[PDB]
């Protein structure tokens, strides 16, 4: 099981950005795919989660108008578009699958994708 996310991104404030998470080595539709925000000194912070089978979602009230979780079943990938970017959105975003039939536990995480919302000088 491997969750290979996209490389480091550089994007201006106001613009949008699309991150990825190509899952492999297992049944993509069997597991969920959460998303987390790790900033320095803030620990972890929940964004949401998506069931690939049906594309149903459940967001945090803070990140309801920020993130956009979707999937592509053929490529077994999971995306997350962050819009209206600011200095607060500068964080390493991960993707962590979860078994949910009987019990809800994490297992395999991604390497992370460092996002830097930097203005053009």
């Amino acid at each position: 099981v491997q969750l290979q996310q996209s490389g480091a991104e550089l994007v201006k404030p106001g613009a949008s950005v699309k991150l990825s998470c190509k899952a492999s080595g297992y049944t993509f539709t069997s597991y969920w795919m959460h998303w987390v925000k790790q900033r320095p000194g803030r620990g972890l912070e929940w964004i949401g989660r998506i069931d690939p089978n049906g594309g149903g979602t459940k967001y945090n009230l803070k990140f309801k108008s920020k993130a956009t979780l979707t999937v592509d079943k053929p490529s077994s990938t999971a995306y997350m578009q962050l819009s209206s970017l600011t200095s607060e959105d500068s964080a390493v975003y991960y993707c962590a699958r979860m078994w949910y039939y009987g019990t809800y536990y994490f297992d395999y995480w991604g390497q992370g994708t460092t996002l830097t919302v930097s203005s053009a000088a």
Partner: protein, 108 residues
Amino acid sequence: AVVTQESALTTSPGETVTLTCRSSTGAVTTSNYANWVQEKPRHLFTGLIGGTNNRAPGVPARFSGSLIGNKAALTITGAQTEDEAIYFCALWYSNHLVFGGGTKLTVL
């Protein structure tokens, strides 16, 4: 809902140590499905336990989940040198998850 824990703990090699995960709203129940994750250096995350006490495949059996009083817990019976890492928990509110501050375990 703020998720309180201990800021940091310090166990010796071989000794037992008990982390915790308080909830601000009230006592932690089985409906919260208390999760646990270990962040080793170089940004290496690995989910240990979830749904209170149900372990994931590939996770060492020394890690165990329970409801001690009004909090969830991660008892590391027989701590290793490789266990030296941060430990975030995550309680469920009925519609989303909420992570805590984290607990930096330091094994001597």
